[PDB]
């Protein structure tokens, strides 16, 4: 049981079901602008593990 929690982030409606949706797990979200097909080649090769 948790007491003395904290509020980290919103993501609108809060449900353990919705908060997962499809669980990302350890995937990383590049989450910047762009069509995503221009950089996707260049993030691999020069960046990223």
């Amino acid at each position: 049981e948790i007491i003395r929690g904290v509020k980290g982030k919103d993501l609108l409606q809060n449900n353990i079901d919705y908060i997962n949706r499809s669980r990302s797990y350890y995937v990383m979200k590049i989450k910047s602008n762009l069509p995503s097909s221009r950089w996707k080649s260049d993030v691999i090769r020069f960046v990223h593990p």
Binding site: Y25, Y26, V27, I44, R45, F46, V47, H48, P49
Partner: protein, 647 residues
């Protein structure tokens, strides 16, 4: 493009260098000589003051090469002449593996008369191996490292070790600090070297087997000094270390280098080894198992010979993207490379999203097919030291798609010399050279027309050629196939995807003549993918069945009809059982024999070929699946007809 600002350019030698065609030089000089300056007052003549112009133009066109070539081999991407290339690749931290030696791991069954526990097996332990082309002559082998054994139960040892090709040589030298210590011989794999300085150790720098966090000084350096003869030297240190650098010798020392002679790449054969062991009571019991690991084995691997110019460059610049560390998919490809290379032809490392960590590495050895083990575990360790700490590298090996040719070269009897055989083999490597050059690597397709133009290039007498073709892709576990796996990536040309062999067991007893009985191991089976239908459909069948063993129930009722689903040739009594899907348009195969619910024990060995023929002539590739043909290992499918012509 769209916006003109994106034109830029690739690597471009500017118009400043380039260099003369001659007469254009004559043009520019005349305009500079006659015009803008003199308006000739020249005292030579009407013709001479003209003629003498090109007399100094040959002086230009000369000095425009002799001195202008330097800037070509000053840079890397534009240079020619190895020497400059190599020498400029060490400041990028590379070195080009001047040669290489074969390596295996053999497990010696030997034993000692003294029965003493913890028998050793010191460094050299000279062996010899035929590396078979026929039989005659050995080469040599040396273990080069240590190991240990253990006595258990019956008195025997299993001192399994690994061994390199050449012998060894040790030249001790006094360090003058004015004397650039070197070797001069055409040899000496830089991968395996020791170089003690008078005490021990000296683990150097450029190549770590450990990396020994901290440890400061005692490093040394190995580069080139062109000429093919390797340079050793030491840092700027003092040790009165002072601050940072190499420990350096002190003005006089015994510097003991030991390398491996490395006879050459001719030794790839391996196979049978002999003891040739004289140490102490060790009997050298033999029963030497060259490949005690795993599936199919080619013999030794490596052997090197110096890397080509077109190789170095690509690996020379990319190692500026890295600094001695692999954080990136393209880094593992550079770390599985001439460092650990010559044992791996191509890589394409990738990471699977569903499974975190676990960087996956596909690799094809030059020996072909699978890396076996301990040549895999070796690639494991050398990475994980430079790797990104939590994630573990793993060698999956690619998913191989071979192709079955059945081609006929139809030469002419008139113009030959060595006739058949020698031409039978001369057509092999030309085909093999086609793979190694174009389609050996990933993402590249092949065209049978391009294979035939290397076929027709055999010598002369061969005129014309042609082939059928089948794409062969062999399943590993069989009995199931993975989930949404086993895909060609090409259009399958329905009424294809033909079986292999199989077999059965059980079927009651069925005793035979002579001895007591048998298990009824005859009466094989095999799979056929039938037709197309309204859209994909098509099903597939497990194969011929007589009667008896199955579970019929309500869910099976074996039949496709006397329609397509072509028949295996035996008694076999038809009654083909439906098994799996095989959607044609998006290439997919699905089996799961458990549908008809038989026992896996009723089947013989797994790892069966299937090999549908392609629709289109050209065979594509994707998802890290190579198309590479290697003959020497598996002859099973290559068949060629020399059917001749008399004029």
């Amino acid at each position: 493009p769209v916006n003109y600002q994106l034109t830029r350019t690739a690597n471009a030698i500017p118009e400043i260098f380039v260099g003369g065609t001659f007469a254009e030089i004559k043009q520019n000089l005349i305009e500079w000589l006659n015009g803008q300056n003199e308006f000739l007052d020249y005292d030579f003549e009407g013709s001479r003051l003209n003629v003498l112009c090109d007399l100094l133009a040959y002086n230009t066109l000369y000095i425009q090469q002799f001195g202008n070539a330097a800037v070509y081999e000053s840079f890397m991407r534009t240079a020619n002449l190895r020497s400059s290339v190599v020498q400029a690749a060490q400041d990028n931290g590379y070195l080009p593996t001047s040669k290489s030696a074969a390596q295996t791991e053999i497990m010696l069954t030997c034993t000692d008369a003294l029965n003493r526990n913890y028998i050793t097996i010191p460094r050299g332990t000279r062996f010899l191996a035929y590396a078979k082309d026929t039989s005659v002559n050995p080469y040599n082998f040396v273990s080069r490292e240590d190991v240990i054994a253990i006595r258990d139960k019956n008195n025997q040892y299993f001192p399994r070790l690994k061994l390199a090709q050449g012998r060894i040589v040790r030249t001790e030298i006094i360090y003058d600090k004015l004397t650039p210590i070197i070797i001069y011989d055409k040899n000496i794999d830089r991968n395996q070297v020791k170089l003690y300085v008078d005490g021990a150790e000296w683990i150097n720098w450029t190549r770590k087997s450990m990396v020994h966090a901290g440890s400061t000084s005692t490093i040394y350096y190995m580069r080139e000094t062109i000429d093919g003869n390797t340079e050793f030297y030491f840092g700027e240190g003092e040790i009165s270390a002072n601050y940072i650098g190499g420990l350096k010798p002190t003005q006089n020392s015994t510097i003991v280098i030991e390398y491996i002679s490395t006879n050459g790449a001719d030794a790839n054969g391996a196979v049978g080894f002999s003891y040739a062991d004289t140490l102490t009571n060790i009997t050298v019991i033999n029963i030497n198992e060259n490949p005690n690991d795993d599936p199919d084995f080619v013999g030794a691997d490596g052997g090197g010979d110096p890397e080509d110019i077109e190789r170095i460059r690509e690996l020379g610049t990319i190692k500026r993207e890295t600094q001695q560390r692999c954080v990136t998919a393209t880094d593992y490809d550079t770390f599985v490379s001439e460092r650990f290379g010559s044992i791996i032809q191509a890589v394409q490392t990738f990471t699977d999203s569903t499974k975190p960590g676990y960087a996956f590495i596909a690799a094809k050895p030059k020996s072909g097919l699978y890396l076996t083990t301990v040549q895999r575990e070796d690639i494991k360790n050398y990475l994980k030291d430079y790797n990104l700490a939590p994630i573990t590298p793993s060698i999956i090996s690619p998913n191989y798609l071979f192709i079955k040719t059945n081609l006929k070269v139809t030469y002419a009897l008139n113009k030959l010399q060595e006739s058949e055989q020698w031409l039978e083999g001369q057509i092999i490597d030309k085909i093999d050279r086609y793979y190694t050059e174009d389609v050996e690597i990933f993402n590249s397709s092949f065209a049978k027309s391009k294979m035939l133009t290397y076929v027709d290039d055999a010598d002369h007498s061969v005129i014309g050629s042609s082939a059928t073709i089948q794409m062969v892709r062999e399943v590993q576990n069989f009995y199931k196939t993975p989930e949404a796996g086993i895909k060609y990536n090409n259009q399958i040309k329905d009424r294809s995807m033909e079986s292999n062999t199989f077999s059965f067991n059980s079927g009651r007893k069925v005793v035979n003549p002579d001895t007591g009985l048998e298990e009824d191991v005859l009466y094989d089976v095999r799979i056929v993918s039938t037709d197309r239908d309204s859209k994909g459909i098509g099903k597939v069948i497990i194969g011929p069945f007589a009667s008896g063993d199955v579970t019929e129930n309500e869910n099976i009722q074996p039949y496709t009809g006397n329609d397509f689903n072509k028949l295996a040739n035996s008694d076999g009594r038809d009654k083909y059982y439906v098994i799996g899907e095989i959607n044609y348009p998006a290439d997919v195969i699905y089996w799961n024999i458990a549908k008809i619910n038989l026992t896996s024990e009723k089947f013989e060995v797994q790892t069966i070929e299937l090999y549908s023929d392609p629709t289109d002539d050209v065979i594509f590739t994707r998802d890290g699946s190579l198309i590479v043909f290697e003959n020497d290992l598996r002859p099973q499918y290559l068949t060629i007809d020399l059917e001749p012509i008399s004029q």
